[PDB]
Amino acid sequence: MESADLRALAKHLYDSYIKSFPLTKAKARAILTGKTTDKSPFVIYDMNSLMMGEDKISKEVAIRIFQGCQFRSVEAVQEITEYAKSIPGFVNLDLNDQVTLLKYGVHEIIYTMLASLMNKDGVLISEGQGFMTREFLKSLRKPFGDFMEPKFEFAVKFNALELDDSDLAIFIAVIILSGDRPGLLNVKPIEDIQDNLLQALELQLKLNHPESSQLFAKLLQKMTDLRQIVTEHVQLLQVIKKTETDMSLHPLLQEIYKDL
Amino acid sequence: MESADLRALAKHLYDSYIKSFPLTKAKARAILTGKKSPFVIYDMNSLMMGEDKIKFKHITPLQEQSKEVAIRIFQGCQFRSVEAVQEITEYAKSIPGFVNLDLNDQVTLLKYGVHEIIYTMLASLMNKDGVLISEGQGFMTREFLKSLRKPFGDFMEPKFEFAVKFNALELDDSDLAIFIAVIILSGDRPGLLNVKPIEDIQDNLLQALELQLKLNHPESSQLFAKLLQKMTDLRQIVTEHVQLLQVIKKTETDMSLHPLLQEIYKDLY
Ligand SMILES: O=C(O)c1ccc(-c2nn(C(=O)c3c(Cl)cccc3C(F)(F)F)c3ccc(Cl)cc23)c(OCC2CCCCC2)c1
Ligand SMILES: O=C(O)c1ccc(-c2nn(C(=O)c3c(Cl)cccc3C(F)(F)F)c3ccc(Cl)cc23)c(OCC2CCCCC2)c1
């Protein structure tokens, strides 16, 4: 609750975030804007560029891309879980509430952090080694094309806030420590942690974006749109599963989606 | 370098050690010796009453957990160990020079060090008759732990065997604060990128521990050497520990936790 303490918490979370997520927004942005020789991605914009891309960096292409999304989402769940344990107080919570917070929080976080990998033309893949175009993703057949596009729609709006990794590290923590998740046993300790995270985010945004009016409020308003987009994602994903048999969901994602 | 620098480092680490860990050795020993009473778990019925009266957070039934007591206690060890890792990680940041290391090397040092540190610090909570749990609110007997069925009983006992020998050195919290730092700053962990600064810090921690032990146990002959020799018992039992855990997972079908819980505890299983 004191500034030094709030700045210390910000530094802690940023450092843990760097340790936990291999591909930061800062690195993604350097790749997307370029001007460098060594970091240029191979761009996948059609079927044949995809073929060449596998040789550089079976199933029907839409499915293969879906399985690529879910395999990375599972890895992201693992990275997010490691990050969560570094949030002060999280591992001391009731073990059931830890599961619950991760269960309902990972999806919102994956959307947030996916945006870091995206611009209006596509998304970085394979640790930034590839770039798959939005138009290619959107043109995937039957339900898959429309499954991909809303991730871009959110990302373009979220990215206009110009958050950097130091901002995102605290924002992600706030999302995880949401006391309103269904089935929480002890709301008060989660809310006490979140108030400290919210206080730290508030000061971080004031110091890092002093010219950005009410960025704190605008970012909390983004957490609202995240709740709606994750809801649409699950409903669409359920429909796809009840139509496509060639789709396995990783048992970790399978568990997260059950009862959700 | 100089005596004052080494004493300052000792005091800095001691002060941080107190801040980082919930139950110090000094407080634990007062409880173990009877100097009010912790709730005592000595059999199945006292365990049931103890979880119902006291809230032993690591041995409370989860959803999708084994109801078998031996498994529940085993997993409780793993859940507390997860908590200890974060405590050790926070302590590490207070060691002068540590946060300036390469971030990958900070991660590596903590990764390969926490097991040795958890064993070491567990000894502070243990005597030959049992172990303090829940910040000293409970005391679980060695006989109860050792009498758990199949491999679980034999998984518990080696921890007591080590602790009893380690505790004969009669280290206090000011000694342990430096010793634990020395363990973290081990230059021989696999995959370190820049060993030189890690050994430079460890050499300072070693000088500080050597002087600490001379001043705090002037009558304890070659205590510095005997404590470094305990790295032999520590490296060996962590090795044994890994083999034991493997047998349990490749044998026990009733160990299922919610996959998100499995992910949280993934480095300790
Ligand atoms: O690296 C990451 O951090 C990363 C993170 C996320 C995705 C991703 N997840 N995702 C989902 O639907 C999804 C979500 Cl958001 C949350 C949870 C579960 C899922 C799902 F299980 F259902 F999969 C996308 C849809 C559209 C798009 Cl463009 C991306 C995703 C991701 O994409 C990897 C590559 C996409 C292009 C082809 C090659 C692989 C990468
Ligand atoms: O408070 C602490 O600082 C504390 C510290 C350690 C333990 C502990 N760790 N441990 C391990 O096996 C272990 C080790 Cl040493 C190193 C690394 C990882 C593990 C493991 F992940 F595999 F778990 C025990 C075995 C036997 C016994 Cl008696 C204890 C431990 C500890 O136990 C708490 C339990 C509460 C419920 C009732 C039973 C004791 C508490």
Curated annotation (Swiss-Prot), chain A:
Q: Name one GO biological process term.
A: BMP signaling pathway
User: Where is the NR LBD domain positioned along the sequence?
Assistant: 5-259
Example GO molecular function term?
sequence-specific DNA binding
The record's region (Interaction with FAM120B) falls at 2-47
Could you describe the post-translational modifications of this protein? Phosphorylated in basal conditions and dephosphorylated when treated with the ligand. May be dephosphorylated by PPP5C.
* Compartmental location: Nucleus; Cytoplasm
Q: What is known of its domains?
A: The 9aaTAD motif is a transactivation domain present in a large number of yeast and animal transcription factors.
The record's function comment reads: Nuclear receptor that binds peroxisome proliferators such as hypolipidemic drugs and fatty acids. Once activated by a ligand, the nuclear receptor binds to DNA specific PPAR response elements (PPRE) and modulates the transcription of its target genes, such as acyl-CoA oxidase. It therefore controls the peroxisomal beta-oxidation pathway of fatty acids. Key regulator of adipocyte differentiation and glucose homeostasis. ARF6 acts as a key regulator of the tissue-specific adipocyte P2 (aP2) enhancer.
What is this protein called in UniProt? Answer: Peroxisome proliferator-activated receptor gamma
Show which stretch of the intact protein is covered.
Answer: 235 to 504 of 505
